[PDB]
Amino acid sequence: YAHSQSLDRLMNPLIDQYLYYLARTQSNPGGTAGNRELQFYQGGPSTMAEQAKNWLPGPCFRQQRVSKTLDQNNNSNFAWTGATKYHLNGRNSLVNPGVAMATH
Amino acid sequence: GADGVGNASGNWHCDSTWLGDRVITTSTRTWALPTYNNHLYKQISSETAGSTNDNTYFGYSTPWGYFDFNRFHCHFSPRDWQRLINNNWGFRPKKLRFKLFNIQVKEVTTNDGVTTIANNLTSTIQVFSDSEYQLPYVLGSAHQGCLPPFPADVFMIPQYGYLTLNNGSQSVGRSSFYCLEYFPSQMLRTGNNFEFSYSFEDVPFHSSYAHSQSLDRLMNPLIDQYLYYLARTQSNPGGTAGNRELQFYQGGPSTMAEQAKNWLPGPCFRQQRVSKTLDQNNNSNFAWTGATKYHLNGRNSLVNPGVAMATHKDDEDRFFPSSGVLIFGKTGATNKTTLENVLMTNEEEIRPTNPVATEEYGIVSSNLQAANTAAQTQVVNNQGALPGMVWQNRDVYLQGPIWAKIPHTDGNFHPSPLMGGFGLKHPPPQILIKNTPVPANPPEVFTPAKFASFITQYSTGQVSVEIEWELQKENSKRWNPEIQYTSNFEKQTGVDFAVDSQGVYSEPRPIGTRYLTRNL
Amino acid sequence: PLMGGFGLKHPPPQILIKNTPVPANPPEVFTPAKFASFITQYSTGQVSVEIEWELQKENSKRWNPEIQYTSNFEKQTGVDFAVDSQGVYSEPRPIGTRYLTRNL
Ligand SMILES: Nc1ncnc2c1ncn2[C@H]1C[C@H](O)[C@@H](COP(=O)(O)O)O1
């Protein structure tokens, strides 16, 4: 199965949380100068990214990005040199395919 | 449902029963359910209000409402909460019993400013619990609309809507549409009532104890280890020149930090440090820019509250992690407030086993030394799990969420809700409720078109929920007195956790579960 | 009780009564706030109470007649312990329990 929801969006879009987050470390600028203030909002439909969440995405061990259209790739050989590989007993072993991660 | 109109379908039960190792808490409230969306399902998306790439969403909004009792203060009076955390090392839920009764439906008419409300006897409501977890699960997201803290309050049932996959503001073809009239649902008139029972799956006791020892200090102070460590890479300088030597000492009372240890502190994912005294903070906006956030599918999502970590260091009370705490409002606070109006929780009780949320995990060597080359090290801001780590989950608060649903996935690591409470693979089902449509008089000659025209109505009634909690007794042999949660004592203008002159119930402070101590 | 009567460590319990709130029509879009808006209503009905009293009989050998509590006898504008022309019930005097005598 392929999930029909995402971790960040598991919330309820219509309702506004009772947990505050730290929205701004300055006063709302009036076009003059930033003034120190602490301001807290509620996680809600407007701002989902700031909203409190119970879960975190899976682990990742990163790897280089290659494009199928040749002209967008750099001109060099980064295959082995810019590879993502693990170092075991003096041996550099390419990480293939690696930890499961979304391709693009 | 059994009897007719003039017979009440159920008694009011709000009570607490403390017996042995269990505590059975019953709470009853009066609820009111409006008519949402004029009985329509509307696809909602961020396309309407531009927002930003991180906040885009796509989903649906439903006429259905739902009952939420996901906070502790629903089931606990502050007194009962005081008995729990003072006398016990842990508690977990066992069974659940849910009842709707004394259902009333009202029809309302508006003529030239006059609002007339009258009973509608024959109209019904629809209630079904989702036992099979087939719907999107919006509980555990810490929304509002939960039963009020205070039994005499009346509350309105929140609307049910859900989100799905999207590309920008559009809908990817994997997006799902769930029609909620496609499930079996019991229909209830004023004589009918609704009930079901539930049984929690076995979960670990929450830890209501704060350790009395720290990982680094678990040793014996009087005795000196038999394991050497590498003390110095030079000869003891006589004030002339450093001379290469290798020297080993024994771990002992003098030097505890160098001493060999079996265990490592819990994992950390670091976050920025903010001070409550304004003049000590930088002048800039680092809130979102200097935030600690995770990058998922092109979306930058703030990490809140994050992995459980001690909020501040030993002597520093005023600092708190930027995103690393649960923050509550004081009574009568809007959705945009300053520092004084929030109630900010701190975890100081996990300082022994956990890193401080605002500081590094450790420091680690980045290079191979040589005769000419000097040793270099780098700081560890984030650390995954390493064999030999121990940690403590975030505490639960009287206002905090009780449970959350562990998503259905191939794998997870030590699932517990980062906000707090009990991770459940099969949580208490979602109870949904709706007012059945009543059509206004049809045109008298047939037309195929949708009605869109109904009698405006709402329904009210009572709901009761009874959870059976299991306890873990305090065995400790500690000689000196424990810390406890204590009421104010000194005179004050009004009682804490009680109504003021205007009838507004108010909770002055958050209350955590960790007071009693035990050895690490 | 210094006022009088029977001191009880477990007296007749307090019977409390309230009219359950009936909400007025809610706004149709969710708000967390307290209602404060209800349908004004009251309730009426009957209540009955039945107490079983125990007595202690008068054994006295006293020869001459006792004092008793006696009604007015002589004509008056209206009866004692009864409604007047306006329907107002009235109690003319207090009445104590101590008339019959016994030796000290
Ligand atoms: N919150 C929560 N829910 C479910 N499972 C959890 C949770 N925290 C940890 N675990 C898992 C991970 C541990 O290996 C194990 C301890 O279960 P024990 O019963 O203590 O032997 O349970």
Features:
two-stranded antiparallel sheet, part of a larger assembly, mainly beta, 0% helix, binds 2'-deoxyadenosine-5'-monophosphate, 3 chains
Report on the architecture of this protein.
- This is part of a larger assembly, with three copies of chain A.
- Chain A is mostly beta strands and about 100 residues long.
- Chain A has no helices and four strands.
- In chain A, strands 1-2 form a two-stranded antiparallel sheet. In chain A, strands 3-4 form a two-stranded antiparallel ribbon.
- In chain A, a hairpin with a 2-residue loop joins strand 3 and strand 4.
- The radius of gyration of chain A is 22 Å and the shape is elongated.
- The two termini of chain A are about 20 Å apart.
- The interface between A and B is large, with 51 and 74 residues.
- Strand 2 (about 35-40) of chain A pairs antiparallel with strand 21 (about 335-340) of chain B.
- 2'-deoxyadenosine-5'-monophosphate (D5M) binds near residues 203 and 415 of chain B.
- It is classed as virus.
- The entry lists the keywords Icosahedral Capsid, AAV7, Adeno-associated virus, Parvovirus, Gene Therapy, virus.
- The full AAV7 capsid.
- Chains A, B, C: Capsid protein.
